[PDB]
Amino acid sequence: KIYGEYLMLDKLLDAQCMLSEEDKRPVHDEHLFIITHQAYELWFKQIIFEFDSIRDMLDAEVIDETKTLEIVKRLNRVVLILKLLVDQVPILETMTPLDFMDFRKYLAPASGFQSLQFRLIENKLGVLTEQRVRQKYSDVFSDEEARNSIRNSEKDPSLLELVQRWLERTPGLEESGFNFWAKFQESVDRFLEAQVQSAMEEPVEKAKNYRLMDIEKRREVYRSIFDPAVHDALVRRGDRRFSHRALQGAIMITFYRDEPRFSQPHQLLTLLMDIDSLITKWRYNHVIMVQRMIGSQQLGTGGSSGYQYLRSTLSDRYKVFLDLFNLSTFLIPREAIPPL
Amino acid sequence: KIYGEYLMLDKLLDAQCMLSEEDKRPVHDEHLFIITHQAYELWFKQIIFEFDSIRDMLDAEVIDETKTLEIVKRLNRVVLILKLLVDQVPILETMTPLDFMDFRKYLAPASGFQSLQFRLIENKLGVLTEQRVRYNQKYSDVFSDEEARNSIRNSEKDPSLLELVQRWLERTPGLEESGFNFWAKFQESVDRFLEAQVQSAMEEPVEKAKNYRLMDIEKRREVYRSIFDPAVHDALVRRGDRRFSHRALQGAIMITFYRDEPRFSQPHQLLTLLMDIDSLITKWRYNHVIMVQRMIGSQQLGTGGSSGYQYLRSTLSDRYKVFLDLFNLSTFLIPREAIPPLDE
Amino acid sequence: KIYGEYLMLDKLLDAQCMLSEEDKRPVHDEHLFIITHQAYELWFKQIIFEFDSIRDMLDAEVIDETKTLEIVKRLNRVVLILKLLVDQVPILETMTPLDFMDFRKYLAPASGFQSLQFRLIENKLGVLTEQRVRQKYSDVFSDEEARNSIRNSEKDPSLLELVQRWLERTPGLEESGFNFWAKFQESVDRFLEAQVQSAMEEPVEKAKNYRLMDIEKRREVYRSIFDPAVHDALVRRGDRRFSHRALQGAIMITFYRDEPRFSQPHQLLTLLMDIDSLITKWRYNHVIMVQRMIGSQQLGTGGSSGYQYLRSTLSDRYKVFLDLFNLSTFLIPREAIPPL
Amino acid sequence: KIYGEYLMLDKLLDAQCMLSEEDKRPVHDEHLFIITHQAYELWFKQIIFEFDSIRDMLDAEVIDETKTLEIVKRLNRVVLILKLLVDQVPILETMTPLDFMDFRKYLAPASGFQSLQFRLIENKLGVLTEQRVRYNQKYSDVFSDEEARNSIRNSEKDPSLLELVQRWLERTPGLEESGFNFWAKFQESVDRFLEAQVQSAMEEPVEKAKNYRLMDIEKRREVYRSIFDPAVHDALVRRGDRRFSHRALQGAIMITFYRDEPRFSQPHQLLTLLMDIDSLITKWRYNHVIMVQRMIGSQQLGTGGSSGYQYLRSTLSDRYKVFLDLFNLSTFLIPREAIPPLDE
């Protein structure tokens, strides 16, 4: 009813227990260490809440403009929360390595790997278990409800899977209707044929050859999308994650983004990329903080494996919407884009 | 002693209770409303923790260079936390006024005035109870709990950061009349500097330019009378224009004059961070009023008029600025050539 | 053709002239003072360029969804540029007051009042000359092309005037069509009548009276918008700037913002408010910097009039879209809003 | 000497020439493209100015506390400018790929490689020419102008901030074998500390726990061999893992151990700011590659394949990090109780 009761500050503000204080040798910065983590976990709970609601709205045959606006609003909110979480790292960096050394021994069985909510965010966004650098990540959890939650987050459709189903059903790709993919192939042939005819008229012979070489590079780019087998091979080696039809829809969305009907679906894709990039930015800032606190290896780490694992999470293997970042590779000028 | 147990996530993550969900009409954004406030309250607890530790270090006769560096580190930490809290406002602003309307009726007896930690931060920094804008109810009357009232009473009576910083400034080495005797040398430097300015102003060819400089030199003399005449300083303190004791103000001025000197650089950084904290609390106040206005306007159903909004706008005044004196110290500055040279 | 030539760095990077260096007594921070101002002026030129293009798109009878998206994009860009300009103040604050004192004497005839581009931004956004705290601001400019530019920025329709014409023509306000204003008045009567009937059933008599008192406060709020004469009086005393019909359109936009047809026009209004608030935030950060460099008064200022003028620019007199900030005062719950 | 004349806005504001406008097909966003780059180049000139002044202060036998404070102030200023430059990327990202396509063809001979000031910042900070990733053309070959080539050559041969910081670290008071003799005391402290760790590990009841601790103590001994055996340090320097001389590394380690001490706090802040600058240049590199990829993908018409994109991705490696050694100093830290006590 009143402020403190509505926010349950009785419970919230009685969850801070400094172990160095319990051992009668308090380290002032352990309080900051606890509060920073607790602020991360409150926001992880909010991100999970937003993600689950967006997954429910995406797990439907009909995705109208009203629901699309609501998804864009909540993805944008997650982007703001992730920027705030990236800014929480310089606050914990204000703790000196020597002060952290005076209480890190009490952490002992605790590990960053034991954050159930961080794993739930990764899985709900779409981090594939097979693409993780590897004890299996889920083995760290001994609690049955924690194991159940992890297992459910892996088997339930992730934002990656749901966004792909939505992209596959993009109105415009329909061969009976607008038939975008076929028109796009013809536009590429017409555009590239004109580029070859224009390259021949070049005065300097070195400039004529550079353009003919460049046009061949373009043809190889278009073979990677117009030949389903070349796309499938790229998917197999981890270079792509999207189904061939989801990729077609994402490309069409980027081509018509200035059109009122395609502007919000394009904003939805942009925010997915921003979320992906912000998670990587948190990963990078976290490794820099780990290195400034305890170096690449310290007493208690048993070598540099922990640090090296953290550095390997910065690879494109942990990027969920990897395909979205490369879509501008397939773009042709406005004059060559098939008219709506 | 695993991650979840060490951080007591059993307790921390079971403190979210949506009242709209309890009334069988859940509003999705109520969860954001609760989480945002809980993140503010966790950081308020950290700011209180840092403030209390800084107050203990300042409540001592001996404030060495090692303790000064530690105070500067923790004040800088509070600055970073306050910038983060200012950035939490745009997150809550993603909630639309219509969605907030569907759960604000459950808030009913709850009020932002009931945040004990926010009041504790204000009092521990140094907001005087007499300088608060009041339309009816005293700020402490909002708390019915005896331990909350006791905490508020203790934060008012215990020395604030404002009081403790003043005692530290009064004991500034350099002000000692037996030693460096800064205040007297400063007065002589002002006379020598201003007398030279008058002699230079007389040589001006244009009469309009000669008069502007003589008028400006008189403005300077009035500025220096406000600090060299203790009675003029005392009157400014009485009308709320100043908060510092005359000797604390002398110390603060001396610190700004010699900030480039190794011995005065950390004490100047300590003062700069107090100003930054003051300024950041005002920035949070401004962003909060903008958000309040965009959510419920200047008045809405349930507010009984515009007094809440008008009260929030009045907290943006210099009445709520704690280290008000620090912001105006450059008014008393003279050029490097005129500053009394340090011996050692 | 090459990088330096395309960006005219020959010209751009030969515009830095330290007067303290010319007088054989260089002050290192004068370089920062010049560069900071020059970076402000480059971005002021960009803001003016964006504003003029938005004014051209708004000065048309037909404002379609395609043009609305483009205006929202460029207003958002101006918001990002203004946040960057606010962040340039802490960079100049790194210069100590004593170092600024060693070169401020060379500034002499130069004044912040002589920034033609800052005045052009204020006028193009919509700062009324009559609402300025006052030598007239335009008297500071002796150059004929500068005076012409200022005069043109005052007489040409500002973003404030153009946004109002666009709001007046809002489809939905048409008495022949949707007729929003009349339906809104009826909804307010029905909603408030129900609030009175519900207030009577209250168990505590003190709670019943608070609600009846609150309902009367609501009726006085609605009289300020449903009685054109009360709106006109508020406009006369500077409390409002919008025409009665522009205000009706802005209110309707906020009520239906979740609807696909009203989402971009609402984003346009939100960005106008963000721009207004960011200009005020720059004004506040600028006065704080002025005070930390030269106090409320210093040698050369002839008293505190300069500082006091800067503090008076922080008032609602300099806020252009003042009306937009108070629109939530008129809101009724979703169930009471007239259905589209 | 009015505002516009003092800032030479006649010159500054007549440097914007849209090539799409010259070809009678203007693209509105080309103006943003030019202005953004011109704002970067103004700030690059400021960073170069600050760097050159810091290099002059560091190129001296006597580096007093007054000059150290001034270096810390200007390095902090460069940090703020770099954070602002990182924030200029989202502004240019508001330009759509299709609009950039309508004017990118006019850019033709222009290249980001032709920014002389960006190369000057890299070289003055300390990026070694041998550590650069090269696919064909040397980075300096991109410049046809003799004065540009001369500037690049001078920035490579003149002592960089990396070289100057190392000379300053070598002369660290405390390393002197006649005086405090830190390095030898540190080696003894490591032996005493590790020997006690071995004796404590033997008392463990569980055999698996006793072995983990003995394995960990061996990892520590290998870490200390990498710094106490000059040949192991020299091999790491040869393979690019380290850049510092063995004595510069000793000084940097000593500074981190005593950072809480008044005499070591500003030298530690100097090192922290060098790391922050290094890190912020990498953050700009990352944001720039993301923007390049969102505008023109990994390859587009006119790029002749993906070599440009692939080169930009390779600049994110530790090969381009100048003060690489500073980031790993906490690997050598021992607890406070084991750190050799300072005499004076």
Ligand code: HEM
């Ligand atoms: C004093 C600062 C910190 C240090 C020294 C540190 C250190 C580490 C280390 C060494 C690991 C790998 C596991 C291990 O070997 O123990 C790790 C993982 C992790 N940490 Fe931190 N950490 C710090 C702060 C934080 C903060 C503030 C958070 C936020 C919740 C966090 C979240 C995580 C997460 C979620 C992982 C797993 C990352 C992944 O699997 O990709 N850490 N950390």
Ligand code: HEM
């Ligand atoms: C939906 C957003 C919010 C609205 C509409 C809102 C509204 C208000 C109102 C109207 C008051 C005055 C008391 C009253 O008349 O009820 C107030 C005071 C206050 N609010 Fe908020 N608030 C919001 C978010 C927040 C957040 C996120 C915090 C952070 C903890 C907060 C902290 C406070 C505090 C501490 C006060 C007292 C300020 C002072 O006395 O100077 N509010 N708020």
Ligand code: HEM
């Ligand atoms: C060392 C820092 C600065 C100081 C001490 C300073 C001081 C002042 C003063 C005293 C005035 C009032 C006119 C006068 O009495 O001379 C003023 C006005 C102004 N300054 Fe600054 N200023 C500083 C930096 C800046 C910067 C970085 C900009 C950005 C372009 C700027 C833009 C302006 C503008 C546009 C005005 C007019 C504002 C208005 O009319 O509302 N100033 N400044």
Ligand code: HEM
């Ligand atoms: C529309 C946005 C931009 C695109 C598409 C873009 C693209 C590129 C590409 C492709 C290269 C490699 C050279 C080439 O193959 O042509 C490059 C290099 C470079 N660009 Fe950009 N750029 C953009 C914006 C910027 C901005 C705003 C700056 C700031 C001054 C900048 C600075 C540089 C620099 C200095 C390099 C060399 C980097 C290094 O050698 O590590 N670029 N850019």
Ligand SMILES: O[C@@H](c1cn(-c2ccccc2)nn1)c1cc(Cl)cc2cncn12
């Ligand atoms: O993984 C652990 C951990 C353990 N050490 C550690 C390092 C050196 C010597 C002793 C101990 N650092 N980190 C960990 C625990 C907790 Cl409670 C939180 C956390 C967030 N990231 C990681 N974390």
Ligand SMILES: O[C@@H](c1cn(-c2ccccc2)nn1)c1cc(Cl)cc2cncn12
């Ligand atoms: O002061 C209250 C409050 C009550 N209304 C409100 C407004 C309009 C119609 C109904 C209700 N808004 N705010 C308040 C409660 C809580 Cl729980 C938190 C809070 C943080 N700032 C303020 N807060």
Ligand SMILES: O[C@@H](c1cn(-c2ccccc2)nn1)c1cc(Cl)cc2cncn12
């Ligand atoms: O208005 C002037 C000014 C003049 N003084 C000043 C103050 C004290 C003693 C001597 C001189 N400060 N500011 C001014 C010039 C320039 Cl070039 C730029 C500027 C941006 N804001 C303002 N500015």
Ligand SMILES: O[C@@H](c1cn(-c2ccccc2)nn1)c1cc(Cl)cc2cncn12
């Ligand atoms: O390197 C060039 C460049 C050329 N293209 C480009 C890409 C695709 C098709 C046509 C052209 N993009 N970038 C470049 C020029 C300029 Cl003026 C500035 C710049 C800052 N980074 C890089 N830049």
